[PDB]
Amino acid sequence: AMIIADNIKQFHSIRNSLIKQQKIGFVPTMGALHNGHISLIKKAKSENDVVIVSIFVNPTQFNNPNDYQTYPNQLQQDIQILASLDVDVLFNPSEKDIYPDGNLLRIEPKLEIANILEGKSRPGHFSGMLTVVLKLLQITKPNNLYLGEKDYQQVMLIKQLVKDFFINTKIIVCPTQRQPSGLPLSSRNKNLTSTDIEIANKIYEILRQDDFSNLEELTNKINSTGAKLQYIQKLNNRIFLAFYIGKVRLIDNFLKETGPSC
Amino acid sequence: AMIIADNIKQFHSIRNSLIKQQKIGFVPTMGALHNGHISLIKKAKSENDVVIVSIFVNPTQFNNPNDYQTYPNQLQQDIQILASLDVDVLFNPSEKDIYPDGNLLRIEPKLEIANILEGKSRPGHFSGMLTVVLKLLQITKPNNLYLGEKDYQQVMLIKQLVKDFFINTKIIVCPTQRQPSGLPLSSRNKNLTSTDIEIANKIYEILRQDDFSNLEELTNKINSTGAKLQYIQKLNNRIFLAFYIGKVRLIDNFLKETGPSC
Ligand SMILES: Nc1ncnc2c1ncn2[C@@H]1O[C@H](COP(=O)(O)O)[C@@H](O)[C@H]1O
Ligand SMILES: Nc1ncnc2c1ncn2[C@@H]1O[C@H](COP(=O)(O)O)[C@@H](O)[C@H]1O
């Protein structure tokens, strides 16, 4: 029963056939679905008459070509998961569907939250993300949008986006799903080798032991595991960090008081 | 009977009260209405059940502070004009209405048409224009948008905007209204003194006699009136130009074969 729309034309037809009365929920993703994504879909199914999920590996938000080339890809498994969850529509457009004439008009964020942390570490990422989310919102026109708290800055930027361009959509932020160790679920973690996972687990044991009073020292404890910390910052009541293990880039954020708790 | 909506809440009210049967025409402007604007309004009226006119002097598109400070302002006269045209809704928002948190998210054009002529001459103008136009379109959600050919690059850019962000609005381009001399009608014209007016007319007496085979000599003739030419160029089969008379910056474009006729 799941409808799979491989292109915009088909999708428009599908979208135009829904009555205003139906609550429409939307979950944007770049595929390679895990329990994090699934938690978002489950929330949206509990609150909407119609749930749409997108799968689109957005080229304009990849500041790193290798990251892009190696981004995990398993459409058939993804479809199987979405059908299992009774998702109503899968929108899985091509690049040319979303950027008919290339990336000519971009949303450019000019504010502090864009300039720090992920913004600083991934130049041009937030522009690409904001531009594709705006286009995906204009296409799907949902009542409700589901986002993970893991991408904390992304959440706050999309909130600003929906506010500034008068998009009549409610935003629902969902807690970060984690492994028992505390490591957040992430599609890139599929790229982690055997030993890398143990390293990731080392790090989260360190994080669950730490009071975050000495970031230089914690940085040193994290770097000794073999990982390479990119940044760690205490921002109000929340810790933000990002690091590499081998070629894999992992990010996280959590309440200082809780740690990456279960 | 014209409804004047000086804020979003007030505008959402009236907008949301319209039935789908009613074709909505939208004419955005920055106020100080002249026969140029009036022709667009008349076209919209002949083609729609509901006509909306906005008046909003958008600060983010003025690259020149003095230009912004002196930009003509005459809201009461504008209101009288619109009312005699039986315009259904005046949308006249404040800066705060349009930019609740300032100019934090901007549409940035990365393409050729934005990099030449007016785009090069007015750095950051097209970004301002596209951002406010996107907002206005998201607010008004019209069926038909009316734009003047005089702002040629603006038209092309707005067509790209409507395409890229999936706005279901038709764009109607309208002929440039002119003084008997050929001088385009423009709001900034109200800032011209009497002697400025005569320089402007001399420029157009020159243009009407020209074949444009030699822009160098044409530039010298225009500069000899006391005006200061910014640029003059052939793009495709049109002539594009912009010039200052005193502190007043005016632009024009027309087919090379016809010149600024009428
Ligand atoms: N481990 C997680 N827990 C909760 N939400 C997540 C998790 N990972 C990704 N998401 C959210 O899923 C959506 C798509 O993520 P991605 O496919 O990684 O771009 C975004 O709203 C993410 O923040
Ligand atoms: N002389 C004119 N003839 C036709 N349209 C015009 C003229 N001057 C301005 N417009 C259009 O009126 C709209 C508002 O212009 P403005 O208020 O100058 O920003 C734009 O679509 C302009 O291109």
Side-chain angles (χ1 to χ4, degrees), chain A residues 118-156:
Chain A
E118 283 309 280
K120 180 165 192 283
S121 183
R122 311 180 62 181
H125 168 71
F126 281 146
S127 175
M129 180 278 291
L130 286 168
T131 298
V132 85
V133 167
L134 177 55
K135 280 169 173 288
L136 286 169
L137 289 167
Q138 296 285 94
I139 291 161
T140 61
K141 299 180 284 181
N143 303 104
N144 294 305
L145 173 61
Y146 300 79
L147 297 175
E149 175 199 5
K150 157 123 147 288
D151 299 284
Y152 194 86
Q153 276 168 294
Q154 168 168 279
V155 169
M156 305 285 126

mmCIF file of all heavy atoms in Angstrom, chain A residues 118-156:
data_model
loop_
_atom_site.group_PDB
_atom_site.id
_atom_site.type_symbol
_atom_site.label_atom_id
_atom_site.label_comp_id
_atom_site.label_asym_id
_atom_site.label_seq_id
_atom_site.Cartn_x
_atom_site.Cartn_y
_atom_site.Cartn_z
ATOM 1 N N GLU A 118 28.888 23.145 14.594
ATOM 2 C CA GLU A 118 28.711 22.565 13.259
ATOM 3 C C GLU A 118 28.873 23.590 12.111
ATOM 4 O O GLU A 118 29.428 23.284 11.056
ATOM 5 C CB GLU A 118 27.334 21.896 13.147
ATOM 6 C CG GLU A 118 27.267 20.547 13.823
ATOM 7 C CD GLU A 118 28.416 19.658 13.379
ATOM 8 O OE1 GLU A 118 28.324 19.075 12.282
ATOM 9 O OE2 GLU A 118 29.413 19.557 14.114
ATOM 10 N N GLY A 119 28.353 24.798 12.298
ATOM 11 C CA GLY A 119 28.443 25.811 11.264
ATOM 12 C C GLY A 119 29.889 26.112 10.905
ATOM 13 O O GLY A 119 30.238 26.256 9.729
ATOM 14 N N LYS A 120 30.730 26.196 11.935
ATOM 15 C CA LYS A 120 32.135 26.545 11.766
ATOM 16 C C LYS A 120 32.868 25.338 11.203
ATOM 17 O O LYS A 120 33.701 25.440 10.308
ATOM 18 C CB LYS A 120 32.727 26.938 13.124
ATOM 19 C CG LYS A 120 34.191 27.330 13.096
ATOM 20 C CD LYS A 120 34.557 28.043 14.385
ATOM 21 C CE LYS A 120 35.928 28.713 14.304
ATOM 22 N NZ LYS A 120 37.053 27.738 14.433
ATOM 23 N N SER A 121 32.527 24.175 11.735
ATOM 24 C CA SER A 121 33.186 22.949 11.335
ATOM 25 C C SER A 121 32.783 22.488 9.917
ATOM 26 O O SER A 121 33.563 21.830 9.231
ATOM 27 C CB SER A 121 32.935 21.865 12.384
ATOM 28 O OG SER A 121 33.626 20.694 12.038
ATOM 29 N N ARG A 122 31.563 22.816 9.490
ATOM 30 C CA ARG A 122 31.120 22.478 8.127
ATOM 31 C C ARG A 122 30.667 23.717 7.358
ATOM 32 O O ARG A 122 29.463 24.026 7.314
ATOM 33 C CB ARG A 122 29.984 21.433 8.157
ATOM 34 C CG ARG A 122 30.252 20.215 9.027
ATOM 35 C CD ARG A 122 29.066 19.232 8.994
ATOM 36 N NE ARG A 122 28.826 18.698 7.652
ATOM 37 C CZ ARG A 122 27.853 17.843 7.343
ATOM 38 N NH1 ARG A 122 27.003 17.435 8.278
ATOM 39 N NH2 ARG A 122 27.716 17.416 6.094
ATOM 40 N N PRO A 123 31.630 24.443 6.755
ATOM 41 C CA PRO A 123 31.340 25.673 6.003
ATOM 42 C C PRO A 123 30.411 25.372 4.822
ATOM 43 O O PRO A 123 30.713 24.453 4.091
ATOM 44 C CB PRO A 123 32.710 26.097 5.462
ATOM 45 C CG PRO A 123 33.725 25.297 6.245
ATOM 46 C CD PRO A 123 33.051 24.043 6.663
ATOM 47 N N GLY A 124 29.308 26.107 4.647
ATOM 48 C CA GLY A 124 28.403 25.866 3.526
ATOM 49 C C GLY A 124 27.370 24.759 3.724
ATOM 50 O O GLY A 124 26.434 24.614 2.934
ATOM 51 N N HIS A 125 27.532 23.988 4.793
ATOM 52 C CA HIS A 125 26.575 22.951 5.144
ATOM 53 C C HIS A 125 25.179 23.513 5.480
ATOM 54 O O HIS A 125 24.170 23.034 4.955
ATOM 55 C CB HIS A 125 27.097 22.122 6.329
ATOM 56 C CG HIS A 125 26.058 21.222 6.930
ATOM 57 N ND1 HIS A 125 25.581 20.104 6.281
ATOM 58 C CD2 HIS A 125 25.363 21.314 8.091
ATOM 59 C CE1 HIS A 125 24.659 19.524 7.031
ATOM 60 N NE2 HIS A 125 24.504 20.240 8.131
ATOM 61 N N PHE A 126 25.117 24.502 6.361
ATOM 62 C CA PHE A 126 23.818 25.020 6.820
ATOM 63 C C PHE A 126 23.017 25.705 5.689
ATOM 64 O O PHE A 126 21.788 25.567 5.616
ATOM 65 C CB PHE A 126 23.985 25.961 8.024
ATOM 66 C CG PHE A 126 24.193 25.244 9.344
ATOM 67 C CD1 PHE A 126 25.000 25.796 10.326
ATOM 68 C CD2 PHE A 126 23.584 24.020 9.594
ATOM 69 C CE1 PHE A 126 25.196 25.151 11.532
ATOM 70 C CE2 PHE A 126 23.780 23.365 10.800
ATOM 71 C CZ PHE A 126 24.590 23.944 11.777
ATOM 72 N N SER A 127 23.716 26.429 4.808
ATOM 73 C CA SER A 127 23.081 26.971 3.615
ATOM 74 C C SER A 127 22.418 25.850 2.782
ATOM 75 O O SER A 127 21.276 25.968 2.340
ATOM 76 C CB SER A 127 24.092 27.740 2.741
ATOM 77 O OG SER A 127 23.480 28.161 1.527
ATOM 78 N N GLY A 128 23.158 24.784 2.526
ATOM 79 C CA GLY A 128 22.632 23.703 1.712
ATOM 80 C C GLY A 128 21.453 23.009 2.355
ATOM 81 O O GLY A 128 20.500 22.609 1.668
ATOM 82 N N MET A 129 21.532 22.839 3.674
ATOM 83 C CA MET A 129 20.495 22.183 4.461
ATOM 84 C C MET A 129 19.240 23.056 4.451
ATOM 85 O O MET A 129 18.143 22.579 4.174
ATOM 86 C CB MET A 129 20.987 21.962 5.904
ATOM 87 C CG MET A 129 20.022 21.298 6.838
ATOM 88 S SD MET A 129 18.705 22.549 7.588
ATOM 89 C CE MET A 129 19.919 23.611 8.726
ATOM 90 N N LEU A 130 19.415 24.342 4.736
ATOM 91 C CA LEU A 130 18.274 25.272 4.796
ATOM 92 C C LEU A 130 17.592 25.408 3.435
ATOM 93 O O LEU A 130 16.366 25.493 3.349
ATOM 94 C CB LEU A 130 18.738 26.655 5.282
ATOM 95 C CG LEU A 130 19.052 26.691 6.787
ATOM 96 C CD1 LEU A 130 19.774 27.980 7.153
ATOM 97 C CD2 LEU A 130 17.749 26.553 7.603
ATOM 98 N N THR A 131 18.392 25.425 2.372
ATOM 99 C CA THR A 131 17.842 25.562 1.034
ATOM 100 C C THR A 131 16.995 24.313 0.677
ATOM 101 O O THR A 131 15.905 24.431 0.134
ATOM 102 C CB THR A 131 18.954 25.799 -0.008
ATOM 103 O OG1 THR A 131 19.635 27.033 0.311
ATOM 104 C CG2 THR A 131 18.365 25.902 -1.410
ATOM 105 N N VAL A 132 17.487 23.123 1.016
ATOM 106 C CA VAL A 132 16.763 21.892 0.670
ATOM 107 C C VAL A 132 15.524 21.675 1.563
ATOM 108 O O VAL A 132 14.502 21.161 1.120
ATOM 109 C CB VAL A 132 17.692 20.645 0.706
ATOM 110 C CG1 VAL A 132 17.811 20.081 2.117
ATOM 111 C CG2 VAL A 132 17.131 19.576 -0.224
ATOM 112 N N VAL A 133 15.625 22.054 2.824
ATOM 113 C CA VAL A 133 14.470 21.948 3.740
ATOM 114 C C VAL A 133 13.361 22.904 3.314
ATOM 115 O O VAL A 133 12.199 22.523 3.294
ATOM 116 C CB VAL A 133 14.872 22.133 5.222
ATOM 117 C CG1 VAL A 133 13.635 22.330 6.132
ATOM 118 C CG2 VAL A 133 15.744 20.928 5.702
ATOM 119 N N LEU A 134 13.726 24.137 2.941
ATOM 120 C CA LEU A 134 12.740 25.075 2.406
ATOM 121 C C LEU A 134 12.038 24.471 1.172
ATOM 122 O O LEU A 134 10.830 24.526 1.061
ATOM 123 C CB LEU A 134 13.389 26.417 2.064
ATOM 124 C CG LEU A 134 12.426 27.417 1.423
ATOM 125 C CD1 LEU A 134 11.186 27.626 2.296
ATOM 126 C CD2 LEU A 134 13.138 28.755 1.138
ATOM 127 N N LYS A 135 12.793 23.865 0.262
ATOM 128 C CA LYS A 135 12.203 23.330 -0.964
ATOM 129 C C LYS A 135 11.315 22.117 -0.634
ATOM 130 O O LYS A 135 10.243 21.935 -1.205
ATOM 131 C CB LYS A 135 13.322 22.895 -1.953
ATOM 132 C CG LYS A 135 13.999 23.988 -2.791
ATOM 133 C CD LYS A 135 15.263 23.398 -3.491
ATOM 134 C CE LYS A 135 15.897 24.343 -4.468
ATOM 135 N NZ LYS A 135 15.064 24.501 -5.704
ATOM 136 N N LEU A 136 11.770 21.296 0.311
ATOM 137 C CA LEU A 136 11.039 20.089 0.680
ATOM 138 C C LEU A 136 9.754 20.482 1.413
ATOM 139 O O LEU A 136 8.720 19.849 1.244
ATOM 140 C CB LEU A 136 11.893 19.163 1.551
ATOM 141 C CG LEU A 136 13.023 18.359 0.881
ATOM 142 C CD1 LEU A 136 13.919 17.704 1.957
ATOM 143 C CD2 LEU A 136 12.474 17.293 -0.115
ATOM 144 N N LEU A 137 9.811 21.546 2.195
ATOM 145 C CA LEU A 137 8.574 22.050 2.847
ATOM 146 C C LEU A 137 7.578 22.635 1.842
ATOM 147 O O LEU A 137 6.347 22.520 2.028
ATOM 148 C CB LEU A 137 8.906 23.113 3.909
ATOM 149 C CG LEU A 137 9.584 22.615 5.188
ATOM 150 C CD1 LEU A 137 10.146 23.763 6.009
ATOM 151 C CD2 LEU A 137 8.598 21.790 5.995
ATOM 152 N N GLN A 138 8.101 23.295 0.803
ATOM 153 C CA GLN A 138 7.244 23.901 -0.205
ATOM 154 C C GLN A 138 6.604 22.788 -1.017
ATOM 155 O O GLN A 138 5.509 22.939 -1.541
ATOM 156 C CB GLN A 138 8.011 24.869 -1.124
ATOM 157 C CG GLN A 138 8.585 26.117 -0.399
ATOM 158 C CD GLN A 138 7.494 27.128 -0.058
ATOM 159 O OE1 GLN A 138 6.940 27.121 1.042
ATOM 160 N NE2 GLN A 138 7.172 27.989 -1.011
ATOM 161 N N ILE A 139 7.279 21.650 -1.094
ATOM 162 C CA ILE A 139 6.754 20.540 -1.900
ATOM 163 C C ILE A 139 5.706 19.709 -1.143
ATOM 164 O O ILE A 139 4.641 19.389 -1.677
ATOM 165 C CB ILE A 139 7.920 19.630 -2.367
ATOM 166 C CG1 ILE A 139 8.783 20.363 -3.401
ATOM 167 C CG2 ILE A 139 7.390 18.311 -2.922
ATOM 168 C CD1 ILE A 139 10.179 19.743 -3.559
ATOM 169 N N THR A 140 6.022 19.361 0.094
ATOM 170 C CA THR A 140 5.195 18.471 0.920
ATOM 171 C C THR A 140 4.064 19.221 1.653
ATOM 172 O O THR A 140 3.024 18.651 1.943
ATOM 173 C CB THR A 140 6.073 17.724 1.958
ATOM 174 O OG1 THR A 140 6.704 18.683 2.833
ATOM 175 C CG2 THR A 140 7.150 16.924 1.235
ATOM 176 N N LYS A 141 4.279 20.497 1.954
ATOM 177 C CA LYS A 141 3.249 21.305 2.622
ATOM 178 C C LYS A 141 2.574 20.555 3.775
ATOM 179 O O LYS A 141 1.368 20.302 3.744
ATOM 180 C CB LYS A 141 2.220 21.806 1.601
ATOM 181 C CG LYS A 141 2.834 22.693 0.526
ATOM 182 C CD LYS A 141 1.829 23.213 -0.495
ATOM 183 C CE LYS A 141 1.425 22.142 -1.494
ATOM 184 N NZ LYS A 141 0.454 22.678 -2.497
ATOM 185 N N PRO A 142 3.362 20.202 4.804
ATOM 186 C CA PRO A 142 2.846 19.399 5.910
ATOM 187 C C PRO A 142 2.286 20.257 7.049
ATOM 188 O O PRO A 142 2.615 21.441 7.198
ATOM 189 C CB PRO A 142 4.075 18.633 6.382
ATOM 190 C CG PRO A 142 5.229 19.611 6.123
ATOM 191 C CD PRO A 142 4.810 20.453 4.924
ATOM 192 N N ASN A 143 1.432 19.651 7.862
ATOM 193 C CA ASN A 143 0.979 20.325 9.083
ATOM 194 C C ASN A 143 2.037 20.230 10.169
ATOM 195 O O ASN A 143 2.241 21.169 10.954
ATOM 196 C CB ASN A 143 -0.330 19.718 9.576
ATOM 197 C CG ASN A 143 -1.405 19.785 8.532
ATOM 198 O OD1 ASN A 143 -1.735 18.787 7.897
ATOM 199 N ND2 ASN A 143 -1.950 20.977 8.327
ATOM 200 N N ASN A 144 2.722 19.088 10.189
ATOM 201 C CA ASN A 144 3.675 18.754 11.254
ATOM 202 C C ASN A 144 5.006 18.239 10.694
ATOM 203 O O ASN A 144 5.033 17.357 9.835
ATOM 204 C CB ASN A 144 3.092 17.688 12.190
ATOM 205 C CG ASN A 144 1.882 18.188 12.972
ATOM 206 O OD1 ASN A 144 1.962 19.204 13.647
ATOM 207 N ND2 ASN A 144 0.754 17.470 12.873
ATOM 208 N N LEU A 145 6.101 18.765 11.230
ATOM 209 C CA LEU A 145 7.460 18.409 10.803
ATOM 210 C C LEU A 145 8.201 17.790 11.990
ATOM 211 O O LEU A 145 8.232 18.383 13.065
ATOM 212 C CB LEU A 145 8.203 19.678 10.347
ATOM 213 C CG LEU A 145 9.695 19.503 10.029
ATOM 214 C CD1 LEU A 145 9.914 18.528 8.895
ATOM 215 C CD2 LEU A 145 10.364 20.850 9.732
ATOM 216 N N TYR A 146 8.794 16.609 11.807
ATOM 217 C CA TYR A 146 9.481 15.911 12.893
ATOM 218 C C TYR A 146 10.994 15.955 12.689
ATOM 219 O O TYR A 146 11.481 15.598 11.614
ATOM 220 C CB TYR A 146 8.919 14.459 13.086
ATOM 221 C CG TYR A 146 7.441 14.546 13.423
ATOM 222 C CD1 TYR A 146 6.502 14.766 12.421
ATOM 223 C CD2 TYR A 146 6.998 14.540 14.741
ATOM 224 C CE1 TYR A 146 5.158 14.923 12.714
ATOM 225 C CE2 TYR A 146 5.638 14.696 15.049
ATOM 226 C CZ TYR A 146 4.728 14.888 14.025
ATOM 227 O OH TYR A 146 3.380 15.055 14.288
ATOM 228 N N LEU A 147 11.708 16.404 13.738
ATOM 229 C CA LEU A 147 13.152 16.615 13.740
ATOM 230 C C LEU A 147 13.808 15.994 14.986
ATOM 231 O O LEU A 147 13.223 16.003 16.072
ATOM 232 C CB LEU A 147 13.447 18.126 13.740
ATOM 233 C CG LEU A 147 12.976 18.976 12.531
ATOM 234 C CD1 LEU A 147 13.246 20.490 12.772
ATOM 235 C CD2 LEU A 147 13.632 18.540 11.217
ATOM 236 N N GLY A 148 15.033 15.484 14.838
ATOM 237 C CA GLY A 148 15.790 14.976 15.974
ATOM 238 C C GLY A 148 16.588 16.060 16.715
ATOM 239 O O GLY A 148 17.169 16.934 16.083
ATOM 240 N N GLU A 149 16.606 15.991 18.046
ATOM 241 C CA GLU A 149 17.368 16.919 18.909
ATOM 242 C C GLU A 149 18.886 16.776 18.723
ATOM 243 O O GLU A 149 19.656 17.713 18.992
ATOM 244 C CB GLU A 149 16.986 16.655 20.374
ATOM 245 C CG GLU A 149 17.741 17.426 21.448
ATOM 246 C CD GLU A 149 17.605 16.761 22.832
ATOM 247 O OE1 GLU A 149 17.015 15.658 22.927
ATOM 248 O OE2 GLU A 149 18.098 17.329 23.827
ATOM 249 N N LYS A 150 19.319 15.609 18.251
ATOM 250 C CA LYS A 150 20.745 15.391 17.937
ATOM 251 C C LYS A 150 21.390 16.485 17.060
ATOM 252 O O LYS A 150 22.533 16.909 17.283
ATOM 253 C CB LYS A 150 20.925 14.022 17.285
ATOM 254 C CG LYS A 150 22.173 13.891 16.432
ATOM 255 C CD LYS A 150 23.028 12.750 16.912
ATOM 256 C CE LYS A 150 23.768 12.075 15.768
ATOM 257 N NZ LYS A 150 22.842 11.260 14.904
ATOM 258 N N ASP A 151 20.660 16.931 16.046
ATOM 259 C CA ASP A 151 21.149 17.991 15.180
ATOM 260 C C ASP A 151 20.550 19.285 15.708
ATOM 261 O O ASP A 151 19.583 19.817 15.153
ATOM 262 C CB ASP A 151 20.766 17.708 13.731
ATOM 263 C CG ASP A 151 21.371 16.408 13.224
ATOM 264 O OD1 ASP A 151 22.591 16.403 12.931
ATOM 265 O OD2 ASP A 151 20.643 15.383 13.142
ATOM 266 N N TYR A 152 21.129 19.761 16.813
ATOM 267 C CA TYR A 152 20.499 20.791 17.630
ATOM 268 C C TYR A 152 20.430 22.119 16.894
ATOM 269 O O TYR A 152 19.418 22.821 16.928
ATOM 270 C CB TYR A 152 21.240 20.963 18.964
ATOM 271 C CG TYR A 152 20.447 21.756 19.983
ATOM 272 C CD1 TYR A 152 19.526 21.131 20.815
ATOM 273 C CD2 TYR A 152 20.635 23.130 20.128
ATOM 274 C CE1 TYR A 152 18.806 21.848 21.759
ATOM 275 C CE2 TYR A 152 19.912 23.856 21.070
ATOM 276 C CZ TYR A 152 19.005 23.209 21.885
ATOM 277 O OH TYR A 152 18.286 23.930 22.818
ATOM 278 N N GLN A 153 21.514 22.466 16.230
ATOM 279 C CA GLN A 153 21.572 23.729 15.498
ATOM 280 C C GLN A 153 20.640 23.689 14.297
ATOM 281 O O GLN A 153 19.975 24.672 13.954
ATOM 282 C CB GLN A 153 22.990 23.949 15.035
ATOM 283 C CG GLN A 153 23.863 24.581 16.120
ATOM 284 C CD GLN A 153 25.325 24.525 15.746
ATOM 285 O OE1 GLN A 153 25.919 23.443 15.661
ATOM 286 N NE2 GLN A 153 25.916 25.689 15.513
ATOM 287 N N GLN A 154 20.593 22.523 13.659
ATOM 288 C CA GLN A 154 19.712 22.331 12.531
ATOM 289 C C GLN A 154 18.268 22.637 12.985
ATOM 290 O O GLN A 154 17.508 23.316 12.292
ATOM 291 C CB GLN A 154 19.829 20.895 12.046
ATOM 292 C CG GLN A 154 18.740 20.557 11.059
ATOM 293 C CD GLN A 154 19.016 19.260 10.355
ATOM 294 O OE1 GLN A 154 19.800 19.215 9.399
ATOM 295 N NE2 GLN A 154 18.383 18.188 10.829
ATOM 296 N N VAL A 155 17.896 22.133 14.150
ATOM 297 C CA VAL A 155 16.551 22.375 14.660
ATOM 298 C C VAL A 155 16.290 23.872 14.784
ATOM 299 O O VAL A 155 15.291 24.397 14.284
ATOM 300 C CB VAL A 155 16.343 21.718 16.041
ATOM 301 C CG1 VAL A 155 15.015 22.218 16.688
ATOM 302 C CG2 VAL A 155 16.386 20.181 15.935
ATOM 303 N N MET A 156 17.190 24.572 15.460
ATOM 304 C CA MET A 156 16.963 25.981 15.676
ATOM 305 C C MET A 156 16.956 26.784 14.362
ATOM 306 O O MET A 156 16.201 27.746 14.222
ATOM 307 C CB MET A 156 17.959 26.513 16.717
ATOM 308 C CG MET A 156 17.935 25.728 18.058
ATOM 309 S SD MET A 156 16.395 26.075 19.268
ATOM 310 C CE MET A 156 15.723 24.258 19.570
#
